[PDB]
Symmetry: D2
Subunit: 260 residues, 4 copies
């Protein structure tokens, strides 16, 4: 698990929606590598539990602020809080996304459609616009989007959600092309089924949904992912180990095929 | 030009935003192949001129209705008008899209962002939901989305527009997967620079912008596209000549490379 | 059904390996649209039977020559035979491909590896080099490669074959970029499971084994392909309906997902 | 800079063609992270100079063997030499590739065509077959292919080389799917223009010819690559930081666009 990598000493990262699951694993890895990290999520109780969990592991250069990531008020509070705590921003990890609908795409109301894009796409664009001048001031940095393997392979039941993740592939690229002038690299991850609360539904009940879903999605490595399976990639994408990489998506899905 | 193809006798198609350019060329080709076609656009004057142009060529199985494609009132009027005129719907070509912004993606306001998705993505989803039961009643049919090569290669100046076209690649796929049960095939085109009013800006002033832009985009075939360059593909995708093809995008850009 | 399309009057096409299955369906469609066609395959008896099958349908502008498509002697003879019979070449359809191996990729001998590339890739490159000056002399034309959906989704059992089909995606593109100067458009089809002798092992077992295979393969349209499912696309790709399209692959797999 | 990463203590890697350029940078990075590495190339003098360069930096867990990577005799000797020196193999980096041709694809002789595939593809397949039982014996490991961004964007002048790199995208995938059972992850890098002897023709001309090339190549980050730009990615792909990732290609081209 430990890499002795210390690629983030003197860096400040915001990780949105990072009190559980993938976002929390990302924050932990950045802290392990020397970063200062601000995490956010809606519920102060989750912020508190996450901060405690991290500080119990000796990861103390972390602060947390509760807010709704699609609230323009709360977006500004998150960015300003980061500047107040640590004085600068180098890295933004847009990890937020909602998956509330489950059903046929024809049954997605216009309201739910707009809400999916508001939280899953627009809020990441808004957060990028807010952090941009601060990252640019440091001479550059990194922005990472957490999309989904469903961006490439449209899934049943949550297809509208999948479309918003396709959108993030394009948004990642567009911001990469537009922010290169500021030496800000924009990349993304596209995780497969990761065992978190959002995907609990699918794989509920041990091996039965954890063994058929395994080879129903066609996962070559024969297991579902865990949150930490995303952290090494985000750390790599935010570090100088990827200094010549921008605009790219890395699929983290155990070998499931959906593009060349 | 004439193909003697008559693949659409007894079929009814809606082509949105089809009084000029690509949409009008699509409607003309479907009419040439025996279809009944309803065209729409915002301005009644454009509807009138398009209907006249078509009827002067002997293409008389066409009707037109003016409306804003992002108005839910006007969407219902367009679909109901088609059912009133021709009794059924077999084919929907979502050709509408706006490109009002020009500038850096960081300067796209949240309002313009939402408007781009409302017209370029949501309205096509809304039109699909409206026509779906009618196409399904005929035993199946075709829905075609006009995306853009900029869905794959993020362009300068109109990057936000490009992201909405990336979205349509995903929406095309999602609807293909969800509407297969009704034998409704959903595919798209992704045209490069086509010489229309929307792209007049770029290639203005004869060969100078029509010869440098030619090999500034890197077009292997050494010329810009024209609206009719899209019609053969849409006709193919809506016909039984593509009866085993769904969920796919065809790039119509004269050999510009942006995916494998 | 007929399309009544007649897009190929006065045109000459070579279709390789076209005495059965997909190649024969392609040849038949071009002949139906007015073309003169030369077909070939190894076995003179298959040539005879194909020619008689076609001529019995009134498709008499056809001629056949037996040869091995990877033999440089036979390649020259096929091209010269076409020029002698019909005076020119406008269109080459590289339909040929073999898959003798079935098993794990690690058990593919170096010899079988090289043979797969010799027939499935090199022979299409060689045929392209031979026809090129003749197509260029007519002011341009079309070359179509029959790859496979396994070019994008690596299959079990025939993975090495799949790699040769990935190669053809690249070769189609490389030739498109290099022959644009001559107005020769190079595109490809990437069929899914098409019911022919080559794929019989997968789908033989009655219409229930097929229905099972469509669910395993995740074919949205719920059926296997047939050879004619490819013919309309090749005709479209070889016609002026695709005159602004080069370097592209069209997946013909009933909605199986393997790229955006 | 250092990363201080130490992810490879007790691991053994083979890096092919690794006495200059990208391969040497990869070997150096693995050694810096604690690995034992075997490097090879044709010329004993280059092996000597690479070994001395490394040992002068204190990287002494390295050994070298001269051989031709497409020689089955030399392939066996390279693998057996690694086992004799270090007892095991965990990691194979297939870095080798040649491009002797420059010109139009139509002028590539059949012989040069076959030689391109022999070195650039077949030798990596052969090396994979040789190392596989040894990596599998360790409970799994990693194989990395160095393809090229020209696998996705067909280049002028070296199109045939580009096709061999498209092949490697497919081969990486096929091997990923087939070696998953052994917990062997197979991934690839697809570098853009990296400043090495191989690419010198393109970028030699001073830091103004380079700046010009970055604009022609449309490199968002505005500079050419260097060998170390590849090393962090290979190390990441070979480490447990990518333990849920197999079958993927990472483009390392400073933001040049050629797939979604
Ligand atoms: N797990 C998977 O299968 C999977 C696969 C592909 C992609 N992803 C992506 O990974 C990301 C994280 O998913 P996860 O599975 O790790 O979820 P998770 O374990 O349920 O974590 C959710 C986190 O998001 C926070 N959150 C939820 N809504 C929020 C809002 N409106 N504003 C701010 N924070 C919010 C939650 O805290 P509060 O409740 O306190 O707000 C919590 O910290 C998502 O973008 C998802 O699309 C997940
Ligand atoms: N030309 C290109 O370079 C290019 C490249 C890639 C993709 N595309 C796509 O092709 C499609 C058509 O573009 P085009 O270049 O052919 O445009 P165009 O020639 O300017 O045609 C525009 C058509 O859309 C109608 N329209 C505009 N806004 C509308 C609205 N809100 N509701 C209903 N109709 C509306 C116009 O009529 P009214 O003014 O009367 O409404 C007209 O009929 C678009 O989706 C575009 O994104 C174009
Ligand atoms: N069926 C599928 O599921 C499927 C899917 C994707 C792609 N494809 C591709 O479709 C193409 C055609 O295959 P098919 O499925 O139509 O097979 P098929 O029905 O078995 O027909 C194969 C044809 O190729 C000829 N042939 C075989 N070896 C030859 C050689 N060395 N030289 C010249 N002709 C030769 C055969 O005739 P002779 O025996 O007389 O030579 C026969 O006419 C292939 O490239 C294949 O890879 C097939
Ligand atoms: N540079 C670029 O722009 C670029 C871009 C994309 C991909 N790549 C890929 O990067 C890889 C490495 O190339 P590079 O740019 O680092 O080239 P480089 O700096 O010229 O190094 C090439 C290395 O390969 C060795 N080599 C050449 N032929 C060999 C053979 N038959 N057997 C064993 N070793 C051999 C050479 O040593 P000896 O002379 O002693 O054999 C040398 O150590 C290649 O696969 C290339 O296709 C390069
Ligand atoms: O996009 C997704 N595809 C998935 C498949 C399984 C579990 C979760 C998800 C996603 O969030
Ligand atoms: O998406 C687009 N990319 C373009 C390039 C040139 C002209 C028009 C367009 C588009 O509409
Ligand atoms: O698509 C394919 N289906 C197949 C069945 C058997 C052998 C090869 C193939 C293909 O390439
Ligand atoms: O990316 C590349 N840049 C190059 C320059 C010269 C030769 C080959 C290549 C590549 O594959």
């Amino acid at each position: 698990m430990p890499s002795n990598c210390r690629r983030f000493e003197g860096k400040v990262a915001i990780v949105t929606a990072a009190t559980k699951g993938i976002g929390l694993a990302i924050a932990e890895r950045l802290l392990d590598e020397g970063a200062s990290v601000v995490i956010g999520s809606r519920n102060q109780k989750n912020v508190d539990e996450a901060i405690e969990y991290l500080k119990n592991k000796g990861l103390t250069k972390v602060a947390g602020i509760a807010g709704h990531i699609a609230s323009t008020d709360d977006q500004k509070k998150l960015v300003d809080f980061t500047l107040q705590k640590f004085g600068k921003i180098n890295i933004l990890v847009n990890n937020h996304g909602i998956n509330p609908a489950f059903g046929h795409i024809l049954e997605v109301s216009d309201q739910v459609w707009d809400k999916l894009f508001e939280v899953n796409v627009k809020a990441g664009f808004q957060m990028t616009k807010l952090v941009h001048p601060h990252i640019a001031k440091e001479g550059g940095g990194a922005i990472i989007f957490n999309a989904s393997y469903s961006a490439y392979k449209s899934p049943p039941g949550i297809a509208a959600y999948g479309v918003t993740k396709t959108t993030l592939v394009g948004l990642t690229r567009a911001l990469a092309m537009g922010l290169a002038k500021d030496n800000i690299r924009v990349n993304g991850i596209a995780p497969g089924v990761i065992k978190t609360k959002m995907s609990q539904v699918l794989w509920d009940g041990g091996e039965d949904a954890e063994k058929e879903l395994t080879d129903i999605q066609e996962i070559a490595l024969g297991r579902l992912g865990v949150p930490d399976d995303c952290a090494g990639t985000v750390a790599y994408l935010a570090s100088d180990d990827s200094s010549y990489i921008t605009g790219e998506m890395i699929i983290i899905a155990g070998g499931v095929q959906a593009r060349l």
